[PDB]
RNA sequence: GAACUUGAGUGCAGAAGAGGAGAGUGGAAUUCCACGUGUAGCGGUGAAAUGCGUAGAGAUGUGGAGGAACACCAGUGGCGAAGGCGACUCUCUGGUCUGUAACUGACGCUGAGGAGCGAAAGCGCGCCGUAAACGAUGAGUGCUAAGUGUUAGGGGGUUUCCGCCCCUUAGUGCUGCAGCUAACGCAUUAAGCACUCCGCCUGGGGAGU
RNA sequence: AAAAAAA
């Protein structure tokens, strides 16, 4: 029972993950495009972004989170929606990142 | 540094507002040298300040043989004031 | 000697009886290095743009001193040693 | 000044014919596009902002905030313009749903009857209600019937009046704009389509610039990131870039204006 | 589009004024361009400098 | 022999710089691993195979490889003799530019040989040290239309500084006369017109043998 | 392609 936290997005070309952890980057929960049943040109895509963001974001909020902190890796095309998602759900979010190397 | 510097030119002007002298030039050039020379002797592999370095003999080189040419007796004079062959 | 000024960030978990110890400490270390302190303002606890050593604020403190190259190179030696100064910068003032 | 002095005005009588609820005609603004206004919200999240709202239920005070953030910044025009166009439009209603733009709940149009029919209809129930006292039933109902149809009426003529007035001034600017050929101005990018660029000239004139004019290179449009991407050259052309252009094309009679990349 | 340092008599830019400079980073950290900011080039490296020592001492963030 | 100040240099004032050697420190990556949580896919994708893994992977946090570099700024911008030189701070240190002329009074230029610096080399920090180590253009000096941009200064103008205009020094670009050129081109950063000194060439292979 | 508001 935690309600500060960050989350993880790791939007490749391929796949979307999303976990999201505490401050101490213990993971909270997760889930994927993969883990929606998502297969092919569907993971890269901005809906499985969605689902899998809002997905984590509903097993977080059973946690009692409320706050989060977003960090984006990779250059896929679901950061935007992912990070609205967290939005949509409930979670306000404060500090944006962008880690991209 | 420049207190050092106005030590100097008082030390060696050959008349009250002299700094253009040889003299004057040589001996500012002689500390300059003598402080560099301390620079590399910590620094050896600092070879852009050796650079100046090696200009700044030569500027001295100069000018003490335009000394020597102009008046021998202000040659020995200022040689043996400073410490040099 | 020549203008120096001396910022420094003190851990923000620790009493102002401490925090005063710190100052006196390290305002001590300079003048007994043959500084003078010209100046001492306290900017007071503020939020660190990123977390250093796991904190998120600190208590700035920014000395103006006029000293030679000693007195900045141990006060420097020291705030890298305590604990207590997570961060510090020294910066020669330009005239 | 004025403005302000309108607006309270018109706020202020307004709000006093909601307490009163009586039959009444207000000037509302719906708030935004849910989808229209998602785009917004993740294309304002390339540059790294974040909007304490969500597309359903934004508040204006957000909208705002990013507004104020951006100015004098990269990312000024660009945000500014995806604003818009997840706006609406404002239209007359006998409802008092609010002013989302202004960001006040009771809004009408008093100030303006010479010129506007809502107003003389405000006029006519002010003096109906307030001077004349009457506020019994079946003057409401005959207004109430009356209000709906006139709303309507005057919301779709006040979109044909500025459709008009548009195209008379894009007329008139092609018609200004007929000696300017080969003459070259520093226009900034103000829009990136599929079909080509389009660069308003500090004067608000805007004109086109194909791929046909983009010579150089095979651009693309990153619909995400608002923009054209070259590849064979490695050139990127984003919105609100100051950059030169040269009239071509001021065809007159469709409206049309054309530039070609002098530069950037 | 004009350098705000010459424009108002600024000689010396200060890596402690945390505002002051903040008019001269986006949102993120990254520092504005001189095409952006319209400042002169003398003073764009003053600039500069001062938002590298602000970032040293986490007066300002680091980039992203 | 004497005299001189314009070349050269010293003062004095100011200026800019990723110039050099030290020595600390910053954020980051990167990812060998050890382990903290976590738990089913991670994927590669023409999209599938190809891999793979729950014995906990991916994602994720701190020891940590601790060795490398410094995103924005960042500019055919700056500095340097060249090769080069970009996080921040301090220490030590080299050169250049502007202004004033207080001083010296030709102290200057070039420079075989020599010495030093000097890539991936090539190879045991040492040697090696040849090098599209080719803006394909030696150094120094003077002279010979313009226009325009940029960097670091100076003088002036109105104007409250700013601003905007004019003039000027040094650098760095673009365009362009005269002249030069086989042509292409170069053109006050000359490949023009001159003088001093150095380096170098004399058909292609054979042969850099 | 084009928001309020004003004309």
Not at chain 2, 37 to 44: D, G, I, S, V
Not at chain 4, 202 to 227: C, K
Request: a neutral charge.
């Amino acid at each position: 029972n935690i309600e500060s936290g960050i989350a993880h997005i790791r939007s490749t070309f391929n796949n979307t993950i999303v976990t999201i952890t505490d401050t101490h980057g213990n993971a909270i929960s997760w889930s994927s495009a993969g883990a929606l049943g998502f297969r092919g040109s569907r993971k890269s895509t901005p809906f499985a972004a969605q689902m899998a963001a809002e997905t984590a974001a509903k097993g977080s909020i059973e946690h009692g989170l409320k706050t989060l902190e977003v960090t984006v890796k990779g250059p896929g095309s679901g950061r935007e929606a992912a990070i609205r998602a967290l939005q949509a759900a409930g979670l306000e979010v404060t500090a944006i990142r962008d880690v991209t190397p | 540094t420049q207190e050092r510097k106005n030590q100097l030119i008082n030390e060696f002007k050959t008349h009250e507002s002299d700094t253009g002298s040889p003299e004057v030039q040589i001996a500012i050039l002689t500390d300059s040298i003598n402080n560099l020379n301390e620079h590399l002797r910590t620094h050896k592999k600092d070879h852009h300040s050796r650079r100046g370095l090696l200009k700044m003999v030569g500027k001295r080189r100069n000018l003490l043989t335009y000394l020597r040419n102009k008046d021998v007796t202000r040659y020995r004079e200022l040689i043996n004031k400073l410490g040099l062959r | 000697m020549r203008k120096y000024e001396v910022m420094y960030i003190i851990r923000p978990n620790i009493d102002e009886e401490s925090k005063k110890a710190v100052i006196e400490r390290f305002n001590n270390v300079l003048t007994s290095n043959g500084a003078e302190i010209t100046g001492t303002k306290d900017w007071g606890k503020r939020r660190l743009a990123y977390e250093i050593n796991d904190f998120r604020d600190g208590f700035y403190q920014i000395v103006n001193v006029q000293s030679d190259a000693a007195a900045v190179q141990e006060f420097d030696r020291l705030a890298k040693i305590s604990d207590d100064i997570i961060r510090h910068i020294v910066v020669k003032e330009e005239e | 000044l004025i403005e302000e002095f309108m607006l309270v005005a018109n706020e202020t009588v307004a709000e006093h014919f909601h307490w009163m609820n009586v039959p009444f005609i207000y000037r509302i603004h719906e708030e935004p596009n849910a989808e229209k206004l998602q785009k917004f919200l993740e294309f304002v999240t390339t540059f790294g902002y974040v909007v304490k709202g969500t597309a359903g239920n934004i508040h204006p005070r957000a909208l705002q905030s990013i507004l104020d953030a951006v100015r004098d910044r990269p990312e000024e025009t660009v945000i500014s313009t995806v604003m818009l166009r997840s706006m609406k439009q404002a239209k007359y209603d006998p409802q008092s749903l609010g002013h989302f733009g202004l960001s006040t709940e009771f809004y009408t149009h008093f100030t303006s009857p010479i010129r506007r029919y809502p107003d003389l209809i405000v006029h006519r129930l002010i003096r109906t209600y307030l001077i004349n006292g009457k506020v019994d039933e079946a003057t409401q109902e005959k207004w109430a019937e009356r209000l709906p149809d006139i709303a309507e009426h005057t919301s779709s003529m006040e979109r044909r009046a500025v459709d008009a007035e548009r195209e008379t001034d894009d007329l008139k600017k092609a018609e200004y704009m007929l000696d300017k050929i080969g003459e070259e101005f520093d226009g900034m990018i103000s829009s990136v389509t599929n079909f080509g660029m389009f660069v308003e000239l500090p004067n608000t004139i805007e004109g086109l610039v194909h791929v046909s004019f983009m010579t150089d290179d095979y651009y693309r449009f990153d619909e995400q990131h608002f923009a054209m991407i070259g590849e064979r050259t490695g050139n990127v052309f984003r919105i609100g870039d100051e950059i030169t252009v040269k009239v071509v094309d001021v065809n007159k009679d469709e409206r049309n204006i054309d530039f070609e990349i002098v530069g950037m | 589009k004009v350098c705000y340092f010459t424009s108002n008599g600024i000689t010396h830019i200060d890596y402690k004024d945390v505002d002051l400079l903040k008019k001269f980073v986006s949102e993120r950290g990254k520092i504005l361009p001189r095409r952006v900011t319209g400042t002169n080039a003398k003073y764009q490296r003053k600039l500069t400098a001062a938002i590298k020592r602000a970032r040293q001492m986490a007066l300002l963030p680091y980039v992203s």
